[PDB]
Amino acid sequence: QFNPYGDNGGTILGIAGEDFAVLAGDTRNITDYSINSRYEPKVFDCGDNIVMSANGFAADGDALVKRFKNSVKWYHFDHNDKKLSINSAARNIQHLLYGKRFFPYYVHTIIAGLDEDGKGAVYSFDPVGSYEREQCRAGGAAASLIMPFLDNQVNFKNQYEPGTNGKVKKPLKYLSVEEVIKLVRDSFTSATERHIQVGDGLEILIVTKDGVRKEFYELKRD
Amino acid sequence: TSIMAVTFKDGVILGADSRTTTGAYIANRVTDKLTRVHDKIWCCRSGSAADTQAIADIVQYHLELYTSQYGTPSTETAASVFKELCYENKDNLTAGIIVAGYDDKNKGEVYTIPLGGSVHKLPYAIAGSGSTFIYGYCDKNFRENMSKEETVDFIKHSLSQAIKWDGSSGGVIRMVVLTAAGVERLIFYPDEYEQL
Amino acid sequence: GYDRALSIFSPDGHIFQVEYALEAVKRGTCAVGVKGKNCVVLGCERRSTLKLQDTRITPSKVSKIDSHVVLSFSGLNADSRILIEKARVEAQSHRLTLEDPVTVEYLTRYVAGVQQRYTQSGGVR
Amino acid sequence: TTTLAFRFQGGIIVAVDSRATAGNWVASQTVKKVIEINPFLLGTMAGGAADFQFWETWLGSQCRLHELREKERISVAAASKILSNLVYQYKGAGLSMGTMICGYTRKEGPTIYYVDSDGTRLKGDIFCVGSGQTFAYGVLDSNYKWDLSVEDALYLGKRSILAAAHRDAYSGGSVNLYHVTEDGWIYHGNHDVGELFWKVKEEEGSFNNVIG
Amino acid sequence: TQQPIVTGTSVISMKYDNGVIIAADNLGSYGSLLRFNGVERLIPVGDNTVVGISGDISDMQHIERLLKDLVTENAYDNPLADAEEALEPSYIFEYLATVMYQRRSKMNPLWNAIIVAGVQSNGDQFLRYVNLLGVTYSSPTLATGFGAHMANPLLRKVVDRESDIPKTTVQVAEEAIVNAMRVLYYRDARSSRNFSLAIIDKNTGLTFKKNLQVENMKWDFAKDIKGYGTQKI
Amino acid sequence: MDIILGIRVQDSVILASSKAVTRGISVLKDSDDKTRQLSPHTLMSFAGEAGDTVQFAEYIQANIQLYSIREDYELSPQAVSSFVRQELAKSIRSRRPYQVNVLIGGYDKKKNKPELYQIDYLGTKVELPYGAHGYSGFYTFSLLDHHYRPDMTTEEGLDLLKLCVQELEKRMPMDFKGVIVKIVDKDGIRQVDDF
Amino acid sequence: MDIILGIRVQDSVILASSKAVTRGISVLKDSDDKTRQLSPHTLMSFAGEAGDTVQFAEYIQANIQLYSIREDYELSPQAVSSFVRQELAKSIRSRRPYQVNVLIGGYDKKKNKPELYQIDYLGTKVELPYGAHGYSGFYTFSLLDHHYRPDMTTEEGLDLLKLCVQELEKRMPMDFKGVIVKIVDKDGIRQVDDF
Amino acid sequence: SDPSSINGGIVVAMTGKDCVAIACDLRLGSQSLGVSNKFEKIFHYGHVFLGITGLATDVTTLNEMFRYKTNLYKLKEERAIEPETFTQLVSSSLYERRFGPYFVGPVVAGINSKSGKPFIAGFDLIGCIDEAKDFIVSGTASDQLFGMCESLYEPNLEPEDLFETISQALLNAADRDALSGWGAVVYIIKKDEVVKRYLKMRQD
Amino acid sequence: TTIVGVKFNNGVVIAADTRSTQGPIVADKNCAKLHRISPKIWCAGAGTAADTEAVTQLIGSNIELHSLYTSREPRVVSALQMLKQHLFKYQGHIGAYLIVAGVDPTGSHLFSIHAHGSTDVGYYLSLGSGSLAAMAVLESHWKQDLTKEEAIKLASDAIQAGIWNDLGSGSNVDVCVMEIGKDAEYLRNYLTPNVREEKQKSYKFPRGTTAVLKESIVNICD
Numbered sequence A: 001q002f003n004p005y006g007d008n009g010g011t012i013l014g015i016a017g018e019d020f021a022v023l024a025g026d027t028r029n030i031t032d033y034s035i036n037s038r039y040e041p042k043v044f045d046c047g048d049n050i051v052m053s054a055n056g057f058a059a060d061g062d063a064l065v066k067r068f069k070n071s072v073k074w075y076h077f078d079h080n081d082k083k084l085s086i087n088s089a090a091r092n093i094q095h096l097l098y099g100k101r102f103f104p105y106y107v108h109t110i111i112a113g114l115d116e117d118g119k120g121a122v123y124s125f126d127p128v129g130s131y132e133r134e135q136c137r138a139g140g141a142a143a144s145l146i147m148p149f150l151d152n153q154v155n156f157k158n159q160y161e162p163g164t165n166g167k168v169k170k171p172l173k174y175l176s177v178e179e180v181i182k183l184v185r186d187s188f189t190s191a192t193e194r195h196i197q198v199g200d201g202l203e204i205l206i207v208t209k210d211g212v213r214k215e216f217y218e219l220k221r222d
Numbered sequence B: 001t002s003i004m005a006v007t008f009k010d011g012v013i014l015g016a017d018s019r020t021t022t023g024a025y026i027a028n029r030v031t032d033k034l035t036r037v038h039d040k041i042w043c044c045r046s047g048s049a050a051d052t053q054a055i056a057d058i059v060q061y062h063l064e065l066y067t068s069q070y071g072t073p074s075t076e077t078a079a080s081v082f083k084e085l086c087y088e089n090k091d092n093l094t095a096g097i098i099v100a101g102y103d104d105k106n107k108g109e110v111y112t113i114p115l116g117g118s119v120h121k122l123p124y125a126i127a128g129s130g131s132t133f134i135y136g137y138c139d140k141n142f143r144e145n146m147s148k149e150e151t152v153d154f155i156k157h158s159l160s161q162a163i164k165w166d167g168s169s170g171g172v173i174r175m176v177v178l179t180a181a182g183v184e185r186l187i188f189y190p191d192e193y194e195q196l
Numbered sequence C: 001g002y003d004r005a006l007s008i009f010s011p012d013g014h015i016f017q018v019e020y021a022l023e024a025v026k027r028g029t030c031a032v033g034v035k036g037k038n039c040v041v042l043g044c045e046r047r048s049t050l051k052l053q054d055t056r057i058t059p060s061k062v063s064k065i066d067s068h069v070v071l072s073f074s075g076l077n078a079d080s081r082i083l084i085e086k087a088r089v090e091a092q093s094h095r096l097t098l099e100d101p102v103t104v105e106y107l108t109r110y111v112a113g114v115q116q117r118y119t120q121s122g123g124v125r
Numbered sequence D: 001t002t003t004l005a006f007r008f009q010g011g012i013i014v015a016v017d018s019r020a021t022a023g024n025w026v027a028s029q030t031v032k033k034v035i036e037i038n039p040f041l042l043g044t045m046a047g048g049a050a051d052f053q054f055w056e057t058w059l060g061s062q063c064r065l066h067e068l069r070e071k072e073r074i075s076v077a078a079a080s081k082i083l084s085n086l087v088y089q090y091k092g093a094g095l096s097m098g099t100m101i102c103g104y105t106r107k108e109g110p111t112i113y114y115v116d117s118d119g120t121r122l123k124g125d126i127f128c129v130g131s132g133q134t135f136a137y138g139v140l141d142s143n144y145k146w147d148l149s150v151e152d153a154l155y156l157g158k159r160s161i162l163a164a165a166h167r168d169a170y171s172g173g174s175v176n177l178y179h180v181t182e183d184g185w186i187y188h189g190n191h192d193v194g195e196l197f198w199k200v201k202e203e204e205g206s207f208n209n210v211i212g
Numbered sequence E: 001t002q003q004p005i006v007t008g009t010s011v012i013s014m015k016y017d018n019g020v021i022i023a024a025d026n027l028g029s030y031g032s033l034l035r036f037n038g039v040e041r042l043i044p045v046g047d048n049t050v051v052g053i054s055g056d057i058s059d060m061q062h063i064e065r066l067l068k069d070l071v072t073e074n075a076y077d078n079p080l081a082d083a084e085e086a087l088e089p090s091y092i093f094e095y096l097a098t099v100m101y102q103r104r105s106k107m108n109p110l111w112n113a114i115i116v117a118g119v120q121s122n123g124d125q126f127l128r129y130v131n132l133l134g135v136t137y138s139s140p141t142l143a144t145g146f147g148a149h150m151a152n153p154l155l156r157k158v159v160d161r162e163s164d165i166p167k168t169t170v171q172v173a174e175e176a177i178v179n180a181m182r183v184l185y186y187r188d189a190r191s192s193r194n195f196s197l198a199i200i201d202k203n204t205g206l207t208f209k210k211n212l213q214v215e216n217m218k219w220d221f222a223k224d225i226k227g228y229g230t231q232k233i
Numbered sequence F, G: 001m002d003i004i005l006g007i008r009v010q011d012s013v014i015l016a017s018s019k020a021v022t023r024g025i026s027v028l029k030d031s032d033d034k035t036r037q038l039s040p041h042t043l044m045s046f047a048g049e050a051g052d053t054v055q056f057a058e059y060i061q062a063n064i065q066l067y068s069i070r071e072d073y074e075l076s077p078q079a080v081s082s083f084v085r086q087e088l089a090k091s092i093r094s095r096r097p098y099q100v101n102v103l104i105g106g107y108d109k110k111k112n113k114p115e116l117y118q119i120d121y122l123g124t125k126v127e128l129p130y131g132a133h134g135y136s137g138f139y140t141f142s143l144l145d146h147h148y149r150p151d152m153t154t155e156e157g158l159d160l161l162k163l164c165v166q167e168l169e170k171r172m173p174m175d176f177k178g179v180i181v182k183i184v185d186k187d188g189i190r191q192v193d194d195f
Numbered sequence H: 001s002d003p004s005s006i007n008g009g010i011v012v013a014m015t016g017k018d019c020v021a022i023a024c025d026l027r028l029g030s031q032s033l034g035v036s037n038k039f040e041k042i043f044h045y046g047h048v049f050l051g052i053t054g055l056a057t058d059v060t061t062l063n064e065m066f067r068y069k070t071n072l073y074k075l076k077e078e079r080a081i082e083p084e085t086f087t088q089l090v091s092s093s094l095y096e097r098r099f100g101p102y103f104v105g106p107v108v109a110g111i112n113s114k115s116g117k118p119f120i121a122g123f124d125l126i127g128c129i130d131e132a133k134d135f136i137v138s139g140t141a142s143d144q145l146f147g148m149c150e151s152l153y154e155p156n157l158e159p160e161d162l163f164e165t166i167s168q169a170l171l172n173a174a175d176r177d178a179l180s181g182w183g184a185v186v187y188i189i190k191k192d193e194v195v196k197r198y199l200k201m202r203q204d
Numbered sequence I: 001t002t003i004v005g006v007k008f009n010n011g012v013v014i015a016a017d018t019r020s021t022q023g024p025i026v027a028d029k030n031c032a033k034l035h036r037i038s039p040k041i042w043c044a045g046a047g048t049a050a051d052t053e054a055v056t057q058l059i060g061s062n063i064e065l066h067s068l069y070t071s072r073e074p075r076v077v078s079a080l081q082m083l084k085q086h087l088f089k090y091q092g093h094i095g096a097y098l099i100v101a102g103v104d105p106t107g108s109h110l111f112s113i114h115a116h117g118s119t120d121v122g123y124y125l126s127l128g129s130g131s132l133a134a135m136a137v138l139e140s141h142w143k144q145d146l147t148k149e150e151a152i153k154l155a156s157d158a159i160q161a162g163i164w165n166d167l168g169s170g171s172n173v174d175v176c177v178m179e180i181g182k183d184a185e186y187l188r189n190y191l192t193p194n195v196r197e198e199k200q201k202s203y204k205f206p207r208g209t210t211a212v213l214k215e216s217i218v219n220i221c222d
């Protein structure tokens, strides 16, 4: 019997800073035990300083991104070129996803950008449209490997102040863009080591008030 | 697989392709499906590689022990041992075997043993997945008391077609000639048999 | 389906079909409504050119839409039945979804909305 | 999930956990499970995240349209019934919902309505919904009285979620409190179970099963 | 819901410095039966694109008709149909990719794996894959079916990343393709010796090669192999 | 939903309906009224699939109330029961049928006679002196066969009903949290508060 | 079989076990004692598959009694619980496993300490201050987490136990017909008749 | 009805400079229901430590079985069993039940008394040995532990520093798993002293 | 796994990758898949890891006893026969896929065994999930009359094809050379083309970061 879904692997990662936000994702595309492409990007600039990635089943992922990109275009036409805020984009994406509640997009969507106060924002979605703003989110095949590491290093979970008898927690603070990229690179090299569907390359998209910059790094190709 | 055995004036000739498959992947393109159970008693193996090998190994053991006590076994005796294993273990086996041998009294003989474990003595026999495509050809072209050269051509042309149409058959055409003279091995490569 | 725009504007900005529907109301028997301090009273005229009538079974001029709301009318008697029926159905539908009977303003607004819809729908007067 | 809401002398308490799960994977510890529908109406979420997040939001749009059309805030009964009639249309399609529409109006007073995805709609004083509902019931029932103070009622709601958060593997993260009065709903903070458990253990002397 | 009946096996392809190469054998299999031998599975669109198709042949023939019709439709009211407004490889791919995904979304897929190879108007090499699921990806080397498992490893030794493309000539690239086709004949049980090959170069244009054969095969070592372990004769 | 009973006596019809609403391993509510008044002298109790029960009961209630307003007249219990049966008979061959069983107790004012109708989700109507739905019947019917008489008073009927509830509380596996009892007679519908 | 509870306090172990035996739609019995005395200071309650429960309990009882006669000595609760666990651990990989869950309450006379062991049908043993099997735990554990203290008296433990039974009677779907309560302490085993 | 994920739990082991560490959570549950918060999964036979995750009845059974076998080993050999030898005994014993296996994920840890070399090893349920220089993980949050260990770990950590690394690996992995947590224990093992520490973690 | 075997002038060489998987997770990044049956008979194993180790050790044990019994060096065909009959008896339930190779008084030999008990003879063979990637290389570059150094190069190249292109295989290349008249040389980690790059950051925690409830000395002595 025909199975309309497939798994293209890969993994993605979104972190938010004070005045910036990054959305990273490996460039490997796979089916079963074969590599389809070593460089197939799945993190996209969608305009209005919104970056997006829909990881899982690539056909559904591409369709969704394509539709959201189009949703941004028609938002400009219908509302006098108004800039689509990240919170508004998130709600719009929920309706795109939930519109196919009974034949879902098999993807884990993450978007990143700046909120209306200029502060870094990351939203993550399930396949049927539930969403939540977070400082930190990993999605895709290696999400279970990367996420607990982020809890520890970004949000300082389980880390207490030395000598305080485990009474005072390590205080939360924003990370610099330099420190965030370090965590992203270490997260993906660790994920590459222990997950077969992760490797080849790492593409990071950084979002500041000035625009959308890109950075690329090699990953192990085995 | 495509396999066959054909009796002729001077004895009998066994023939086989060399393809072993796992689904559509060719696990071995130079397989030897013609195997010795005694000096001048051989067999063609089709079906499960594991089953046919395990069976042939046991038969060779039985006929070796037979020879130690009672001297050279008949081709019929060899076929009976194959049958006994194939029939009594029909539920756990997937083996289509052709048995062929040369006596001096009985000359060339061919016994075919299908899945059930039944025995059928014939002038010639064909078996394996690719045999389906050459029933018409073989029936129209087989004659009794053929010469060595005529029988080799008959097997070559037959397996050539079986290979051409069956995806589960291919590679080289192996043959084994059984006569009073001795045991001769023949091989034929794609460049020759494809353009027949 | 019959599509013709029967209710349309005229050069002077009038919709004659609506205005002619008012003339039908002007022809109808008189109906009056007076509300007191703790009550409302609905009075209705019945023309006396009709003797040999059976008042038991003859449709009454005042109709109950629900146990707490009533509707009287003036104009075409056959037309009024259609409005009353729709109103009675909407009354029960309101009780079903809102778990509370209609307000008089709500029921009026619904009936008025029906009447309006027939002034700019094709194929209806 | 674990969610509860109970009615008492001083109005309505509403308490929820904040965990989200995908099987045994803890997806989130910071999910909002209370929907602020309007200043006088709350909705709790236990079941499919998307279904709740989508439809209770939609419910709020329908409640807004009601007060525009009728020039009056919607009743808790009417609000809950819009949602229950909606999910009933989808009955069998596979929606997963157990919600509580909580609010105050003049005509009704403080009111709680249980609504779920197979079409059940129940008015009631106490409800607990979710995978850890039984754990919450145990503590809530055994300590519940109508004459609870606002202070004691808030704590019991908080303590009941904590009880479930502890025992139920699919409940945890943090507790979100709400108090609903005649004047509207009041938010009473986010309470991380990480710190709250030990604070409650020490001060209350409970949770002796755990290695202190 | 379908099941494929008459099927075509691997389609292989790669990029080189000035263009792209693509190849696929001429077989139409009917299960294990090697039914049809004169089946062309490379279909040119204009003088700048070649679409290589594997999978169900009835669906392949349907796609042929769609592409044929696309050329006709593009020529309508288009004075620049053979110039600036000619069909690009990227246009042809996106159209097919749209169709493939729409059909999978209606639970009635075109049971195919497709590779669109060509050269754009600005000289850039185009090579992209799409299948029954609507999944799309691009890579210096692309292959379907068994080609994905056996050809890609060999072709990736020549062009392992982007920077290797300018360093790869058409002679070296074609040699690697022809070798891959031989390996597939050795190891794929639903392949044939006869195949077609197509080159799309930004300078010399479209070159379509028919009736090619796998040659220079190694079989001689077979004669030495006897039995399966202990046999000596 | 589980236990609904009905007993017709000389001058009235008595309906008893369990108060428990259970979901999974939790009794969510112990004061649920599984009935709707269709008209002043007609009462319908119900039991079955969650959601379907109330949705169906309220749908019928609305239709009977609409009829009452339109004709300024109360439909007879027989007429109401036939309407209900037809709706269920339509339902059973629908895409998704109402899985609801009902008892209709009414007092016919023209005949001056109490009437009890039992209708299952298939649309199977029967007029009975006493009726039940679900597993309740397996205990109560045999008990009522013995103790029931056709000329009983309302008070005798309530004692007969107590005897049934006691038996169910003794031998039924599940705790159904007692019953709400309602009486239908010439003066309309009223609820017994202490049972 | 359904509800079995256990609470270890300062100087005793208290086991509560439901009295109902239900079969299909019939409560066959409302006075069933779901326990066996293994030795003078060791008591085992049980719940699970019909037949298996009693067969297993009596088999263990016989083995512990055989040991007592042979050595003229009473095995410690820890020793008995380890024996029971091993028997269940053997059972789970048998052709037909015992589907029986048990609680073992005992008073160790050498240590002068009460001990409660919870063992499921797989052979999963844990020593606990309070324990339960089946759906009972989903209500009682959270309640005991709150109200339980390690230095409680037997009387305080019985009130704590009443609180559990009340909660179960309120929120459990099935009628389990109350509980038989037994106390294990330095003086042996005795039954509370009025609960 | 997946034996390995009914009770839940995790074990992790690491190596350091002239030392090894092994740690585990304390949860025992029955699917969603948490039952016990005192269920330790690490045992020791002489100086050789063994952690076992998976089906709790088998965890207990195997502990008793390896105590049985190491006790007889010591009586006959007149010496304590070493980690390398014990690792082989675990593998033999598990593979003995090849077609009716114990649903477990064991982990060996210890220091060889003769050579002084730190040693760790892991197994699947049928006894395949997984030796490692760096770390071994096991349990329902193995994916999480793999991610934590692979990023946090560095070679030649001192006993005091190694304690921090393994503890943070366990805690943050456990918090992302529903069936793991409810307390934790860490063993720091030097040549001739062994320290055992209970960690403070969130109790949900 | 990817495993290969290649015959040459005066002997035979076998090779293997060093990845061990557990679903999509890499369990061991440097596991040994080359097994010693006897001093000059070695075995490359793919499939169920416990089965390949257990079956290779059992036959290896019996081969040693047989060698001592007969006062003769063990033959490859003896190991082949003992393995196939064992595997056949278990009807494929013992998931061992082996490449058996070695030298003995008869000469040099190369065989493969499958889980169901079928054996194959060849000058070049490949088994495991990456056998197609490896066999592609072998079919492209193999020739008759290979030297020792040429056969090692070909074998390792065939493993590399698996390492890079197959997600089931990765990490390092192990080799074992068995030449006639010489001791068999086992080249553990012959190639290491997948070294982990330096991490961006050290995650060494300040001492006292972890909150502690209890401490206690453990008694290991008698």
Ligand SMILES: *[C@@](C)(CO)[C@](*)(O)[C@H](CC(C)C)NC(=O)[C@H](Cc1ccccc1)NC(=O)[C@H](CC(C)C)NC(=O)[C@H](CCc1ccccc1)NC(=O)CN1CCOCC1
Binding pocket: B001, B002, B019, B020, B021, B022, B023, B027, B031, B033, B045, B046, B047, B048, B049, B050, B052, B094, B128, B129, B168, B169, I114, I116, I118
């Ligand atoms: C022609 C090819 C067909 O009749 C010949 O008859 C030859 C006979 C020669 C080799 C003696 N037959 C085969 O090549 C034979 C075909 C076959 C396949 C399955 C069942 C019966 C016959 N192929 C085999 O025996 C291969 C040889 C291996 C690759 C060395 N073995 C398999 O394909 C195994 C056998 C499993 C089996 C099934 C039923 C009965 C006995 C054994 N199959 C697999 O490993 C399946 N594999 C699982 C992973 O996914 C790919 C498929």
Ligand SMILES: *[C@@](C)(CO)[C@](*)(O)[C@H](CC(C)C)NC(=O)[C@H](Cc1ccccc1)NC(=O)[C@H](CC(C)C)NC(=O)[C@H](CCc1ccccc1)NC(=O)CN1CCOCC1
Binding pocket: A101, A104, A125, A126, A127, A128, A130, D001, D002, D019, D020, D021, D022, D023, D027, D028, D031, D033, D045, D046, D047, D048, D049, D050, D052, D096, D130, D131, D170, D171
């Ligand atoms: C307690 C916490 C859990 O019992 C509560 O009940 C909460 C209520 C809150 C969130 C409002 N419920 C959940 O957390 C809920 C449990 C659940 C899941 C699925 C169906 C019913 C109930 N969890 C979710 O809804 C999660 C949300 C997080 C962000 C992942 N989402 C999913 O499980 C999604 C969508 C599920 C779905 C429903 C209908 C059709 C299709 C899908 N599924 C996945 O994410 C799948 N999974 C993610 C990991 O990758 C492998 C696939």
Ligand SMILES: *[C@@](C)(CO)[C@](*)(O)[C@H](CC(C)C)NC(=O)[C@H](Cc1ccccc1)NC(=O)[C@H](CC(C)C)NC(=O)[C@H](CCc1ccccc1)NC(=O)CN1CCOCC1
Binding pocket: H004, H054, H103, H104, H105, H123, H124, H125, H126, H128, H129, H130, I001, I002, I019, I020, I021, I022, I023, I027, I028, I031, I033, I045, I046, I047, I048, I049, I050, I052, I095, I128, I129, I168, I169
């Ligand atoms: C390549 C890499 C792919 O096959 C190679 O063939 C290697 C061979 C080398 C390692 C010898 N194969 C594997 O690594 C092999 C792949 C595999 C997995 C599962 C079934 C068959 C083959 N992996 C394994 O054998 C791992 C090795 C671990 C690290 C010890 N074992 C498992 O994955 C076991 C499988 C055990 C098994 C049982 C019954 C039938 C067949 C296999 N599975 C688990 O441990 C899963 N689970 C973990 C939680 O606890 C319960 C068990």
Ligand SMILES: [Cl-]
Binding pocket: B020, B031, B032, B033, B049, B053, E228, I118, I119
């Ligand atoms: Cl063979």
Ligand SMILES: [Mg+2]
Binding pocket: A221, A222, I162, I163, I164, I165, I166, I167, I168, I169, I170
């Ligand atoms: Mg790889």
Ligand SMILES: [Mg+2]
Binding pocket: D164, D165, D166, D167, D168, D169, D170, D171, D172, H203, H204
């Ligand atoms: Mg919890």
